[PDB]
């Protein structure tokens, strides 16, 4: 057989929706739980007791299976190793609910938990329903943040926002302390003032997890599965197939090292673990499906528990399955499964990488900027009432007098003998 | 009424940390900048363009407020007018540890009395440091002629010591070295009066220990039947305490000479003993002050011999004002004995506008008849050592210590080992200039 | 150099300071004059108020070239300013140009700002050139206003006309009740136009004015150096200096009547552009004038020099004197400085020189409180605007008069009784 196999890595999870790495060399795997938690899995296989991110109070999650509200996606800044920037999309309530896209920053004190005080709202998408929400975040090799939103089943209500069913592309590397993101010049509606500049492409309804090929001859490829009504696949570069009888969870482009034959393949799978591969003809540019099969080889088995909720990718490129059921949710037993090529060793010699354990932030901005926030580029944006280079000097208007010092905004520390808000009074 | 006043002398300084004179009669004031500069203020009120000392590349200085790294202290040898010797303590990181607190000896340029010859650096001590607070390192000479070094505890915990990675037996102690030595191996010798000079357990340099985060210490010279008095402010952990320094005491287990809750604007920056001339009433008094210019006087009860704090007030009299800009960073004393405060703020640092302020007694003239002194302008080095000793270094006493490969009274003759042969001349150490007919590194072979 | 004085910097960041003075209201404020047309307040604690005391830089024509004397020239506070808030200002404007002397009044709402609407033009002297302008304002111990004007004109220019006032010392009485003319002529004036008290000056520096003398004394410098004593009805053309001395010509002078310096009391001090000072003192024995040099020397922080060139002098309410300096370099950098003269032989605050600040109060006179449709004379009489009459000008005047019992509410506006129409209620309905 040419089949692959599924190996259980961890269990005891709650409604896992995805997993990914930070690209800092630490080979940590960050697991997303719908209720609003992000947990760390170390390379030795331990789950840290303290969540990396706990926002379950902010997050509105649904009870019933099929309620898509919750924590949707996470993307680490391409330069997270130096600036500790990460991005999160979740649902909350204030007009049913509102889909947020927020930036967070890792604690300068602890590289394994996020400083919750560093939240910055980037986008707030008004939502009217609880399905077709999308919410995937990813960075392209251009360095830009892509946001993939469903349509939220809005149509006649649209006549009465404007971001649903589109792929947004923001530039998070801005110096303007006014706006959290700037629009890249390449966007199709930059400075048009008729369509939103953030919109890069539209027309999505209920997209699954999109496969992201990163490859020279082409910069970036995003393939999405989509099921408006009972499936179709869509390409964004720099209707694609008549397959039937499926509802696809999503897909990935395998760039791992354990499987030689799977390299470069687009893999898609449905709720029940039926996997297919997509192959484009370089000659005819037409897409074709071949099933990918699972079979048991010792410990790694040709099956897994429950239903697929999302996919994972570690820093070495190996891909994962995240599963749960209605039985596994109340029992608090979601699982993380690795996809293995049983034809190949578990650690082929060429696939070894040395763990570089995660270090605290070393950048000049995080170290000295305290009365404001740090942009991903490093500019320290001061809070109101501060103006230093790192916002360390307070502003007092009117100025402190009789030698007073402006210690905090509009607060004068007077010398003995001088009173009043600006030390203007004598005796 | 009975207040003092504060007079601005110069501005445009960069994070000044202290000021002092060289005792050579020139009435120059040397101002210390944290980033690693020493500037000269002439008696006529001029700041020289060229710094007296520029070691800002050597110096590791800190950005954060509360980051104490930088140029810490300076002390002129008691005989600087004759030998041009000065001592400097700064933090650097060029040699495990966080940074290293060095105490170095420099010597004024023999061509220019207003610049120090940077090539004459001699490292005396290198104290490994682990943190960036409680590390203050004040340098001063007592009337014994010895160099006192006052080091904080560098916030080094007891478990840090159990590894003894960087020896740092010196933190939290007062070191006392004898710099007037002739041994060219060691830079300083230990005075026999030291309490541990033979003890193989305690360090011989340690004169007293038990300090944590001491401010600038007041140095009375009695210029009261005792030879030496040194008072330091100290923060045991907030409830500021003041300490008298006497041979071989441990100030975790020694009574603090006074304890008073702070004024809440800041802990005590430090203090001085006023031996100036402009103010009659202030003579002999111990003054201490906090970050915000709250000044105290220490007065002993003749009845109980107990010390007590008494406040001093500031008030405006024309140009002389009862306030000043920013926060106190350090103190100053000129050659006539008048005391100064150096101030800066967060706003004054980026503007590069630290200031030097003179403390004035407005009840007295600015130049009372008796306080007049004649300026003796600084002269270049005339000592026999600086003039003739060229292949080595000069000890503060005058002995010329040769570099490896040199000998002579003033190290003027090179050494060749093995010696040059057949009339050859030893021109540089281990280089023979042979006469024609004789070859080889020592002219040993005959042709 | 045992007897020198010293210079202590008080404030900087000024722009072309030309003088400083106090208001004699007990507040110990020091009012600094900036050439471009500003007057700034320096508090005794050494602060400069953000808002100027007087901002007339739009009205003022000031000069660019070094040696162009146009700008704000002088300021003098009325001797009773604490009660009536009257001040006088001399500046140049061009509507070559015209040297104006105007009266202002401190805002009834704010004692630290001048009500710009209370201007009263007293004199308008036509000028033809930009040098030799003088224009010093001062009140003598007689209570009269003295105005000291230079002359930048030539005889050919006189015939082509305009100013009967240039090169004279005018003496006006500002304490008048006549609402027609802003000033009346004192009977003692030698009555040249009646305003002239003495004439014949050319290019005078700042004149010293002694108080606490039995006599009246005003000394002026004039262009080795020439100094003049001013007396009623005197022609100073071709008149010798009091003494011969001798280096720049003299900027001006003052009489030290301060308290910090014992030895300097009663002396006249003069200085040139570069800080070379001389002193004139009358001998108590023979009443004769005598010259003594005054030197500057460093005493610790107090220094025997200063930056740039002297532009004018200052005097605070306690009588201590000041130097105002700038250079061609300090003007572009916008860094003029105010320097205090100190006697280092004496304490900075001698026991006997202490005075308590009486902070400035809003106007309390009956006139400023009740006179609303006119202006207040320094005496207290309320002078009505056209179309108003009465003790406090509170009753409007209607011409022709209102008829049929109508009430004259606003000037030439009748409030008619029911049954009567028209601008004077002349028509019956
Ligand atoms: O403000 C205030 O005040 C408020 O507050 C609050 O409140 C709330 C709360 O909260 C909640 C809770 O909470 S807690 O606390 O408790 O936690 O509650 C509430 O609410 C909620 C609830 O729930 C309710 O209400 S009440 O009142 O009632 O209670 C509601 O709910 C709802 C929902 O919402 C809806 N949805 S939507 O979307 O529309 O909106 C619905 O649901 C439905 C649907 O359908 C679904 O869902 S989802 O999610 O998905 O969307 C589900 O479904 C299901 C079904 O039904 C079933 N069936 S049965 O019959 O069994 O029943 C199943 O399935 C099935 C079927 O049939 C199929 O399927 S399908 O898809 O098609 O449908 C299939 O078929 C099959 C067959 O069957 C066979 N045959 S036989 O015969 O044998 O059977 C064969 O043929 O085979 C086939 C196959 O086929 S295929 O497909 O495969 O080809 O299958 C079957 C089976 O069985 O298997 O199942 C499903 C699933 O399930 S689950 O579990 O997931 O669910 O569901 C449904 C139902 O209905 O159930 O509806 C619901 C109900 O409604 S009513 O009417 O009732 O109203 O609402 C909710 C909400 O959310 O709200 C409360 N309220 S109150 O007022 O009451 O108080 C809140 O807040 S928070 O914070 O919480 O948020 C709010 O409200 C406010 O704020």
Here the tokens at position B203 are: 């360090």
The number of the ligand 1 atom at minimal distance from the alpha carbon of A63 is: 17
Q: Distances from the Cα of A272 to the Cαs of A8, A65, A269, A288, in angstroms?
A: 16, 15, 8, 21
Return the residue of C nearest to B46 by Cα: C303
Among candidate residues B337, B360, B383, the one where a domain is terminated: B360
In C225-332, where do the E strands start and end? 226-229, 250-255, 268-272, 277-282, 289-294, 309-315, 321-326
Nearest CA to ligand 1 atom 100: A65
C-chain residues within 8 Å CB-CB of A399?
50
Q: Which of B306, B237, B295 is nearest to B268 (CA)?
A: B295
Give dist(CA B242, CA B137) in Å, integer.
Answer: 17
Q: Distances from the Cα of B92 to the Cαs of B58, B116, B169, B212, B350, in angstroms?
A: 6, 19, 19, 21, 22
Q: Which of A257, A185, A266 is nearest to A222 (CA)?
A: A266
Q: Distances from the Cα of C357 to the Cαs of A403, A426, B244, C78, C361, in angstroms?
A: 20, 11, 44, 20, 12
Q: Which of C2, C8, C92 is nearest to C260 (CA)?
A: C8
CB contact under 8 A, A402 and C45: yes
Q: How many domains does chain A have?
A: 2
What's the alpha-carbon Rg for chain A, to the nearest Å? 24
Tell me the CB-side half-sphere exposure of residue B408, using CA atoms within 13 A.
16
Strand-strand pairing, C86-93 and C97-106: antiparallel
Give dist(CA B28, CA B8) in Å, integer.
Answer: 17
Q: Are residues A363 and A333 in the same domain?
A: no
Give dist(CA A51, CA C211) in Å, integer.
Answer: 85
Burial of B234 (0-12, 13-18, 19+ CB in 10 A): buried
Q: Is the CB of A65 under 6 A from ligand 1?
A: yes
Report whether the peptide linkage leading into residue C34 is cis, meaning its omega lies within 30 degrees of zero. Answer: no
The number of the ligand 1 atom at minimal distance from the alpha carbon of A67 is: 49
- Angle at the Cα of B187 (from B181 to B193), degrees rounded to 5? 55
Q: Are residues C305 and C398 in the same domain?
A: no
DSSP β-bridge partners for residue B331: B341
Residues 6+ apart with CB under 8 A from B138: B72, B73, B89, B148, B149, B150, B214, B216, B217
Q: Are residues A336 and A346 in the same domain?
A: no
Q: Are residues C72 and C195 in the same domain?
A: yes
Q: Are residues A326 and A209 in the same domain?
A: yes
CB contact under 8 A, B44 and C344: no
3-state helix, strand, coil in chain C (%, to 5): 5, 40, 55
Return the residue of C nearest to B315 by Cα: C45
Q: How many CB atoms lie within 10 A of CB B54?
A: 18
Cα(B187) to ligand 1 centroid in Å equals 86
Return the residue of B nearest to C300 by Cα: B43
Residue B165 assigned to a binding site: yes
Type and span of the H or E element at B290: strand B286-290
Q: What does the DSSP assignment read for B402-443?
A: EPTTEESSSS-EE--SSPP-TT-EEEETTEEEPPTTEESTTS
List residues of chain C with CB under 8 Å from any CB of chain B.
6, 8-10, 44-46, 260, 298-305, 320, 340, 342, 344-349, 351
Q: How far is A424 from chain C (nearest CA, A)?
A: 9
Q: Which of A183, A232, A243 is nearest to A203 (CA)?
A: A232
Q: Distances from the Cα of A103 to the Cαs of A86, A89, A361, B172, B322, in angstroms?
A: 6, 9, 17, 45, 50
B-chain residues within 8 Å CB-CB of A394?
346
List residues of chain A with CB under 8 Å from any CB of chain C.
398-399, 401-402, 426
Q: Is the CB of A66 under 6 A from ligand 1?
A: yes
Give dist(CA A132, CA A228) in Å, integer.
Answer: 9
CB contact under 8 A, C45 and B321: yes
CB contact under 8 A, C44 and B367: no
Q: Which of C10, C24, C21 is nearest to C73 (CA)?
A: C21
Q: Say if residues C115 and C102 touch (Cβ distance below 8 Å).
A: no
Among candidate residues B309, B340, B360, the one where a domain is terminated: B360
Type and span of the H or E element at B286: strand B286-290
Q: Which of B65, B313, B323 sits opposite A403 (nearest CB)?
A: B323
- Angle at the Cα of C99 (from C173 to C378), degrees rounded to 5? 25
Q: Which of C10, C302, C305 sits opposite B366 (nearest CB)?
A: C302
Q: How many CB atoms lie within 10 A of CB A184?
A: 18
Give dist(CA B294, CA B264) in Å, integer.
Answer: 10
Q: Are residues A241 and A258 in the same domain?
A: yes
Among candidate residues C327, C342, C357, the one where a domain is terminated: C342
Q: Are residues C313 and C401 in the same domain?
A: no
In B63-146, where do the E strands start and end? 71-76, 85-92, 99-108, 116-129, 137-141
Determination technique used: X-ray
Position of tokens 């024309």? Answer: B318
Q: How far is A383 from chain C (nearest CA, A)?
A: 26
Cα(A226) to ligand 1 centroid in Å equals 23
Q: Are residues B396 and B316 in the same domain?
A: no
Here the tokens at position B418 are: 């093995």
Report whether the peptide linkage leading into residue A398 is cis, meaning its omega lies within 30 degrees of zero. Answer: yes
Q: Is the CB of A64 under 6 A from ligand 1?
A: yes
Give dist(CA A13, CA C166) in Å, integer.
Answer: 100
Q: Are residues A239 and A348 in the same domain?
A: no
DSSP β-bridge partners for residue B425: B433
Q: What is the resolution of this structure in A?
A: 2.7
Expressed as residue numbers, the domain containing A392 is 341-427
CB contact under 8 A, C45 and B316: yes
A-chain residues within 8 Å CB-CB of B265?
413
Q: How far is A185 from chain C (nearest CA, A)?
A: 44
Return the residue of B nearest to A423 by Cα: B323
In A27-96, where do the E strands start and end? 29-33, 37-41, 53-54, 71-76, 85-92
Q: Are residues A282 and A332 in the same domain?
A: yes
Q: Which of C300, C340, C349 sits opposite B367 (nearest CB)?
A: C300
Q: Which of C344, C345, C348 sits opposite B317 (nearest CB)?
A: C348
Burial of B163 (0-12, 13-18, 19+ CB in 10 A): exposed
Q: Are residues B48 and B34 in the same domain?
A: yes
Q: Are residues C239 and C368 in the same domain?
A: no
Residues 6+ apart with CB under 8 A from B186: none
The number of the ligand 1 atom at minimal distance from the alpha carbon of A326 is: 105
Tell me the CB-side half-sphere exposure of residue C364, using CA atoms within 13 A.
7
The number of the ligand 1 atom at minimal distance from the alpha carbon of A130 is: 38
Residues C372-405 as b/e (b if ≥16 CB within 10 A, e otherwise) read: ebbbbbbebbbbbeebbeeebbeebbbeeebebe
């Amino acid at each position: 057989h040419n089949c692959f196999c599924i190996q259980e890595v961890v269990s005891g999870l709650r409604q896992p929706v995805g997993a990914l790495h930070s690209g800092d060399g630490s080979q940590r795997l960050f697991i997303l739980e719908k209720e609003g938690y992000v947990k760390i899995l170390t390379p030795e296989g331990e789950i840290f007791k303290e969540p990396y991110l706990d926002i379950h109070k902010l997050v509105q999650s649904g009870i019933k299976g099929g309620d898509e509200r919750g924590l949707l996606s996470l993307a680490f800044h391409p330069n997270y190793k130096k600036n500790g920037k990460l991005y999160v999309s979740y649902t909350t309530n204030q007009h049913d609910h509102i889909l947020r896209v927020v930036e967070y920053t890792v604690s300068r004190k602890n590289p394994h938990q996020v400083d919750l005080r560093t939240a910055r709202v980037f986008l707030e998408v008004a939502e009217l329903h609880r399905k077709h929400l999308g919410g995937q975040l990813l960075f392209g090799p251009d360095g830009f943040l892509y946001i993939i939103l469903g349509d939220g089943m809005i149509t006649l209500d649209d006549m009465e926002s404007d971001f649903t069913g589109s792929v947004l592309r923001l530039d998070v590397d801005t110096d303007m302390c006014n706006v959290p993101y700037s629009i890249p010049r390449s966007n199709p509606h930059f400075n048009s003032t008729n369509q939103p500049p953030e919109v890069f492409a539209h027309g999505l309804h209920d997209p699954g997890r999109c496969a992201v090929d990163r490859h020279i001859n082409i910069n970036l490829t995003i393939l999405c599965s989509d099921s408006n009504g009972k499936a179709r696949i869509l390409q964004i570069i720099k209707e694609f197939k008549p397959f039937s009888n499926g509802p696809l969870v999503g897909g990935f482009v395998y760039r791992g090292c354990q499987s030689e034959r799977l390299y470069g393949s687009y893999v898609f799978g449905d709720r029940n673990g039926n996997f297919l591969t997509l192959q484009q003809s370089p000659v005819t540019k037409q897409w074709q499906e071949k099933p990918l099969c699972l079979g048991t080889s010792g410990s790694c088995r040709g099956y897994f528990s429950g239903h697929i909720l999302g996919f994972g990718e570690d820093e070495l490129g190996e891909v994962y399955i995240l599963s749960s059921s209605k039985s596994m949710t109340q029992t608090h037993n979601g699982k993380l499964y690795k996809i293995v090529d049983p034809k190949r060793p578990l650690m082929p010699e060429e696939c070894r990488a040395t763990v570089q354990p995660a270090q605290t932030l070393t950048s000049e901005c995080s170290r000295l900027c305290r009365n404001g926030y740090c942009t991903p580029t490093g500019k320290c944006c001061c809070s109101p009432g501060w103006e230093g280079d790192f916002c360390r000097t307070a502003k007092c208007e009117p100025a402190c007098r009789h030698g007073g010092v402006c210690v905090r905004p509009n607060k004068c520390l007077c010398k003995k003998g001088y009173l009043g808000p600006q030390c203007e009074q004598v005796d």
